[PDB]
Amino acid sequence: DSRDYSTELSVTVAVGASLLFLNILAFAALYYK
Amino acid sequence: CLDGKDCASFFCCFEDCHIRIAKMDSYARIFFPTAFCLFNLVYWVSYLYLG
Amino acid sequence: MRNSRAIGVLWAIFTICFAIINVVVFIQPYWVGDSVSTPKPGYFGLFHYCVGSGLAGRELTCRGSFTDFSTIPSSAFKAAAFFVLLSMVLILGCITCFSLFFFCNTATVYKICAWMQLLAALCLVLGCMIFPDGWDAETIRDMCGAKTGKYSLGDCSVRWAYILAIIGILNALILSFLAFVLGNRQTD
Ligand SMILES: CCCCCCCC/C=C/CCCCCCCC(=O)O[C@H](COC(=O)CCCCCCCCCCCCCCC)COP(=O)(O)OC[C@@H](O)CO
Ligand SMILES: CC(C)CCC[C@@H](C)[C@H]1CC[C@H]2[C@@H]3CC=C4C[C@@H](O)CC[C@]4(C)[C@H]3CC[C@]12C
Ligand SMILES: CCCCCCCCCCCCCCCC(=O)O
Ligand SMILES: CCCCCCCCCC
């Protein structure tokens, strides 16, 4: 166990950042021109 | 303001507003089944799998 | 128009993803956790919470449900759960109005979800801001430590669900803005 959640926080932040990157990419693509 | 006009026009639909209330039946015919299906999906998934 | 339709489909898919995230963070209890400097192991969510039994960390008991407000540790927890539930209801209102895209005009439906997603985002922010107020409760203090208190994590550590809720807040804000821009576009 070791009651360590740094890995959980890292992977959660990674997937969240990827999702937000995709959505802001869509927003920027729409907003261009 | 820049990239849109009138602040409100951009953030509301106060333009024009009526007509849609007559087609309220047509809206409801597909609105209510979709809402009930969504409720069933979320309820059953939560109570069977996430618990 | 092709790009507008593709962006609309992507927006709908990301809205459904945000709704899934909202449901998961509401239901799951892994908002706050335990560290090596903790009196006992455990973790508590908005209304649910599990704590260890005996000296051994194994065989931890669980208690709390939204339907039973008698078991929720504090009114702050109750309010946070209520606000997150309101966010769920509003985003599901959008996923229903995806049906209304059939008949009503696209700009109007897009603006309707833009406002509803904004309201869901505000409800989720209010819930996430009100939730830490309840850490002064007796059970939370016993699980975490004496240092724990109002807006003070103390010896406990945040788990994945809380940061996932923050990510959901950001996603809801940006999705609401995207919906507003889509509604104001493709109508001239
Ligand atoms: C797992 C990941 C999720 C995958 C699922 C993705 C879901 C994908 C669908 C998105 C729908 C919204 C997209 C944006 C809609 C943009 C608008 C659009 O596409 O065109 C209109 C609708 O088209 C359309 O068929 C769209 C009609 C709406 C279809 C949606 C039905 C309800 C969806 C219930 C929720 C199910 C999914 C989530 C469940 C958890 C038709 O123009 P049309 O000028 O001819 O009209 C006449 C007009 O002038 C009014 O008189
Ligand atoms: C159709 C739209 C407008 C509204 C749908 C909202 C539905 C999906 C909401 C309203 C009340 C919600 C429930 C409220 C309380 C609980 C108890 C919790 O321990 C698990 C989730 C569960 C069981 C919720 C599941 C989702 C739920 C049923
Ligand atoms: C249990 C299912 C209940 C019924 C679900 C109906 C969903 C389809 C909605 C149809 C709306 C349009 C009906 C009129 C169509 C027409 O012009 O003939
Ligand atoms: C694996 C858990 C999936 C939970 C999905 C809940 C319904 C989402 C409706 C948008």
From Swiss-Prot, chain A:
Region described as Required for interaction with LHFPL4: 11-31
Localization per Swiss-Prot or TrEMBL: Cell membrane; Postsynaptic cell membrane; Presynaptic cell membrane
Domain of life, per lineage: Eukaryota
Tissue specificity remark: Expressed in the blood vessel walls. Detected in colon, brain and pancreas islets of Langerhans (at protein level). Detected in brain, and at lower levels in pancreas islet beta cells.
Segments crossing the lipid bilayer: 11-31
Assembly: Interacts with neurexins NRXN1, NRXN2 and NRXN3. Interaction with neurexins is mediated by heparan sulfate glycan modification on neurexin. Interacts (via its C-terminus) with DLG4/PSD-95 (via PDZ domain 3). Interacts with PATJ. Interacts with GPHN. Interacts with MDGA1 and MDGA2. Found in a complex with MAGI2 and IGSF9B, where it interacts with MAGI2 (via WW 1, WW 2 and PDZ 2 domains). Identified in a complex of 720 kDa composed of LHFPL4, NLGN2, GABRA1, GABRB2, GABRG2 and GABRB3. Interacts with LHFPL4; leading to mutual regulation of the protein level and synaptic clustering.
Family: Belongs to the type-B carboxylesterase/lipase family.
Function statement: Transmembrane scaffolding protein involved in cell-cell interactions via its interactions with neurexin family members. Mediates cell-cell interactions both in neurons and in other types of cells, such as Langerhans beta cells. Plays a role in synapse function and synaptic signal transmission, especially via gamma-aminobutyric acid receptors (GABA(A) receptors). Functions by recruiting and clustering synaptic proteins. Promotes clustering of postsynaptic GABRG2 and GPHN. Promotes clustering of postsynaptic LHFPL4.
Name used for this protein in its record: Neuroligin-2
Organism: Homo sapiens
Curated annotation (Swiss-Prot), chain B:
Extracellular side, ranges: 48-50
Segments forming a coiled coil: none
TM segment ranges: 27-47
Top-level division of the source organism's lineage: Eukaryota
PTM entry text: Palmitoylated by ZDHHC3/GODZ; required for the accumulation of GABA(A) receptors at the postsynaptic membrane of inhibitory GABAergic synapses.
Record's subcellular location: Postsynaptic cell membrane; Cell membrane; Cell projection, Dendrite; Cytoplasmic vesicle membrane
Function: Gamma subunit of the heteropentameric ligand-gated chloride channel gated by gamma-aminobutyric acid (GABA), a major inhibitory neurotransmitter in the brain. GABA-gated chloride channels, also named GABA(A) receptors (GABAAR), consist of five subunits arranged around a central pore and contain GABA active binding site(s) located at the alpha and beta subunit interface(s). When activated by GABA, GABAARs selectively allow the flow of chloride anions across the cell membrane down their electrochemical gradient.
Similarity comment: family membership: Belongs to the ligand-gated ion channel (TC 1.A.9) family. Gamma-aminobutyric acid receptor (TC 1.A.9.5) subfamily. GABRG2 sub-subfamily.
Entry comment, domain topic: The extracellular domain contributes to synaptic contact formation.
Subunit and partners: Heteropentamer, formed by a combination of alpha (GABRA1-6), beta (GABRB1-3), gamma (GABRG1-3), delta (GABRD), epsilon (GABRE), rho (GABRR1-3), pi (GABRP) and theta (GABRQ) chains, each subunit exhibiting distinct physiological and pharmacological properties. Interacts with GABARAP. Interacts with KIF21B. Identified in a complex of 720 kDa composed of LHFPL4, NLGN2, GABRA1, GABRB2, GABRG2 and GABRB3. Interacts with LHFPL4. Interacts with SHISA7; interaction leads to the regulation of GABA(A) receptor trafficking, channel deactivation kinetics and pharmacology.
Protein name: Gamma-aminobutyric acid receptor subunit gamma-2
From Swiss-Prot, chain C:
Residues of the full protein shown: 16 to 203 of 247
Domain of life, per lineage: Eukaryota
Coiled coil: none
Name assigned to this protein: LHFPL tetraspan subfamily member 4 protein
GO molecular function, one term: GABA receptor binding
Compartment(s): Cell projection, Dendrite; Postsynaptic cell membrane
Keyword Cell membrane tagged: yes
Residues spanning the membrane: 7-27, 82-102, 112-132, 163-183
Any GO CC annotation of this UniProt entry: plasma membrane
